[PDB]
Structures are given as C-alpha cells and as structure tokens.
Amino acid sequence: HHQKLVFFAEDVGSNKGAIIGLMVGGVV
Amino acid sequence: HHQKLVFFAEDVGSNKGAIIGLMVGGVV
Amino acid sequence: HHQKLVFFAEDVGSNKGAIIGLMVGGVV
Amino acid sequence: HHQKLVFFAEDVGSNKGAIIGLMVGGVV
Amino acid sequence: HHQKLVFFAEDVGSNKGAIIGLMVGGVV
Amino acid sequence: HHQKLVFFAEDVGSNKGAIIGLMVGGVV
Amino acid sequence: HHQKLVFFAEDVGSNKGAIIGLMVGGVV
Amino acid sequence: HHQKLVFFAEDVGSNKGAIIGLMVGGVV
Amino acid sequence: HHQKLVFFAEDVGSNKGAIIGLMVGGVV
Amino acid sequence: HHQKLVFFAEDVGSNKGAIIGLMVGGVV
Amino acid sequence: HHQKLVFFAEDVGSNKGAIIGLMVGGVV
Amino acid sequence: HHQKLVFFAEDVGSNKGAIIGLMVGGVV
Incomplete structure (x- = not known):
C-alpha cells in the first residue's frame, strides 16, 4: 500500500x- | 496498491x- | 492497482x- | 516670462x- | 510670454x- | 504669447x- | 522671470x- | 488496473x- | 527671477x- | 533672485x- | 503501508x- | 507502517x- x-x-x-521611482536630470 | x-x-x-516610474531629462 | x-x-x-511609466526629454 | x-x-x-501560488484540498 | x-x-x-497559479480539489 | x-x-x-492558471476537480 | x-x-x-505561496488541506 | x-x-x-506609458521629446 | x-x-x-510561504493542515 | x-x-x-514562513497544523 | x-x-x-526611490542630478 | x-x-x-531612498547631486 x-x-x-x-x-x-x-x-x-x-x-x-530594481524597482526605481523617479529619474530626472539635465540643465534647468 | x-x-x-x-x-x-x-x-x-x-x-x-526593473519597474521604473518616471524618466525625464534635457535642457529646460 | x-x-x-x-x-x-x-x-x-x-x-x-521593464514596465516604465513616463519618458520625456528634449529642450523646452 | x-x-x-x-x-x-x-x-x-x-x-x-493577493498573488497566490498553488491551492489544493479534498480527500485523497 | x-x-x-x-x-x-x-x-x-x-x-x-489576484493572480492564482493552480487550484485543484475533490476525492481522488 | x-x-x-x-x-x-x-x-x-x-x-x-484575476489571471488563474489551472483549475481541476471531481472524483478520480 | x-x-x-x-x-x-x-x-x-x-x-x-498578501503574496501567499502554497495552500493545501483535507484528509489524506 | x-x-x-x-x-x-x-x-x-x-x-x-516592456509595457511603456508615455514617450515624448523634441524642442518645444 | x-x-x-x-x-x-x-x-x-x-x-x-503579509507575505506568507506555505500553509498546510488537515488529518493525514 | x-x-x-x-x-x-x-x-x-x-x-x-507580518512576513510569515511556514504554517502547518492538524492531526497526523 | x-x-x-x-x-x-x-x-x-x-x-x-535594489529598490531605489528618487534619483536626480544636473546643473540647476 | x-x-x-x-x-x-x-x-x-x-x-x-540595497533599498536606497533618495539620491541627488550636481551643481545648483
């Protein structure tokens, strides 16, 4: 059995x- | 059995x- | 059996x- | 400006x- | 401007x- | 302007x- | 400006x- | 049997x- | 400015x- | 400025x- | 048995x- | 048995x- x-x-x-939230760059 | x-x-x-939220760049 | x-x-x-939300760039 | x-x-x-993987039950 | x-x-x-994977049941 | x-x-x-994968049941 | x-x-x-992995039960 | x-x-x-939401660019 | x-x-x-791993029960 | x-x-x-690992019970 | x-x-x-929150850079 | x-x-x-919160840099 x-x-x-x-x-x-x-x-x-x-x-x-990778879980990324916000990405920002460059001259302003 | x-x-x-x-x-x-x-x-x-x-x-x-990667789950990314916002991406931004460039002269402003 | x-x-x-x-x-x-x-x-x-x-x-x-990758699930991305917003992508933006360029001179403004 | x-x-x-x-x-x-x-x-x-x-x-x-809820993300569930396996669910099982019952007499066997 | x-x-x-x-x-x-x-x-x-x-x-x-809910994302479920497998569901099973019953007498066997 | x-x-x-x-x-x-x-x-x-x-x-x-709900995205479900397999569902099964019943006497066997 | x-x-x-x-x-x-x-x-x-x-x-x-809740992310659950395996769920099982019943007489065996 | x-x-x-x-x-x-x-x-x-x-x-x-990749599921992307919005894409934008160029001089403005 | x-x-x-x-x-x-x-x-x-x-x-x-709650992220739970395994759940099991019942007479065996 | x-x-x-x-x-x-x-x-x-x-x-x-609560992140729980294993849960088990019942007569055996 | x-x-x-x-x-x-x-x-x-x-x-x-790596789960990152915000990333920013560039001249401002 | x-x-x-x-x-x-x-x-x-x-x-x-590594779970990082905020990252920032560059001339301002």
Whole structure:
C-alpha cells in the first residue's frame, strides 16, 4: 500500500532586480 | 496498491527586472 | 492497482522585464 | 516670462491584493 | 510670454487583484 | 504669447482582476 | 522671470496585501 | 488496473518585455 | 527671477501586509 | 533672485505588517 | 503501508537587488 | 507502517541587497 504526495511552489511575487521611482536630470 | 500525486507551480506574479516610474531629462 | 496524477502550472502574470511609466526629454 | 512644467506618474507594476501560488484540498 | 507643459501617466502594468497559479480539489 | 501642451496616458497593460492558471476537480 | 518645475511619482512595485505561496488541506 | 492523469498549463497573462506609458521629446 | 523645483516619490516596493510561504493542515 | 528646491521620498521597501514562513497544523 | 508527503515553497516576495526611490542630478 | 512528512520554505520577504531612498547631486 505505497502512497506519495509532492507539493512544490516557486518564484511568487519576488524582485531581485530594481524597482526605481523617479529619474530626472539635465540643465534647468 | 501504488499511488502518487505531484502538484507543481512556478513564476507567478514575480519581477527580477526593473519597474521604473518616471524618466525625464534635457535642457529646460 | 497503480495510480498517478501530475498537475503543473508555469509563468502566470509575471514580469522579469521593464514596465516604465513616463519618458520625456528634449529642450523646452 | 512665466514658465511651468508638471510631470506626474502613478500605479506602475504594484500589487496591494493577493498573488497566490498553488491551492489544493479534498480527500485523497 | 506664458508657457505651461503637463505630462501625466497612470495604471501601467499593475495588479491589486489576484493572480492564482493552480487550484485543484475533490476525492481522488 | 500664451502656449500650453498637455500629454496624458492611462490604463496600459494592467490587471486588477484575476489571471488563474489551472483549475481541476471531481472524483478520480 | 517666474519658473516652476514639479515631478511626482507614486505606487511603483508595492504590496500592502498578501503574496501567499502554497495552500493545501483535507484528509489524506 | 493502471491509471495516469496529467494536467499542464503555461504562459498565462505574463510580461517579461516592456509595457511603456508615455514617450515624448523634441524642442518645444 | 523666481525659480522653484519640487521632486516627490512615494510607496515604492513596500509591504505593510503579509507575505506568507506555505500553509498546510488537515488529518493525514 | 529667489530660488527653492524640495526633494522628498517615502515608504520605500518597508514592512510594518507580518512576513510569515511556514504554517502547518492538524492531526497526523 | 508506506506513506510520504513532501511540501516545498521558495522565493516568495523577496528582494536581494535594489529598490531605489528618487534619483536626480544636473546643473540647476 | 512507515510514514514521513517533510515541510520546507525558503527566501520569503528578504533583502541582502540595497533599498536606497533618495539620491541627488550636481551643481545648483
């Protein structure tokens, strides 16, 4: 009577990069 | 009576790149 | 009485690239 | 010689709700 | 010599709802 | 010498609802 | 010679809700 | 009494490229 | 010769809610 | 020759709520 | 009467990169 | 009557990189 269950989940809502807000520059 | 279940999920709603908001530049 | 179920899902609503908002430039 | 510039951006790549990965249940 | 510029952007690539991956249930 | 420019953009590539991947159920 | 610039950005890549990974239950 | 079920899903509502909002430039 | 610049940014990559990893329960 | 600059930023990458890792329960 | 269950979850809502708020520069 | 359960979770809401707030520079 063998029985095995496997439940796996990965990479949900993650950020290992860059979320930047505002960038501005130049003579004014 | 062998029995196996496997449930897997991956890459759901994730961002490892860049979400930028505003970019502006130049003489004014 | 062998039995196997496999459920898999991938790449749902994810962004590893760039969602940019506004880009502006040039002399004014 | 009046001059005004306004730059605004909002709601870019954001999640205040729920990104869920896997949901499973029931007798097995 | 009046001058006005206005730049606005909104709701770009955003999710305040639910991105779900897999849903499963029932007797097996 | 009056001058006005207005640039507006809205609702581009956004999801405040539900992107679901797989749904399964029932006796098996 | 009046001059005003205003740059604003808001809600970029944020989550004040719930990102859940795996949910499982039921008799097994 | 062999029995196998396989359920697979992929690439649903995802963006690994760029959703941009507004782009503007040039002398004004 | 009046001159004013204002730069503002808000709510970038923040979580005042709950990021949960795994949830499991039920008789086994 | 009046001149004023204002730079403001708020709520960047913060969590005043709960990031939980694993939750498990039930008879086994 | 063998029985095994395995539940795994990974990379949920994490940031090992850079969430920046405002960036500004240039002569003014 | 062998029985084994394994529950694992990893990388949930963590930041080993840099969350910066405001960056500004240049002659003014």
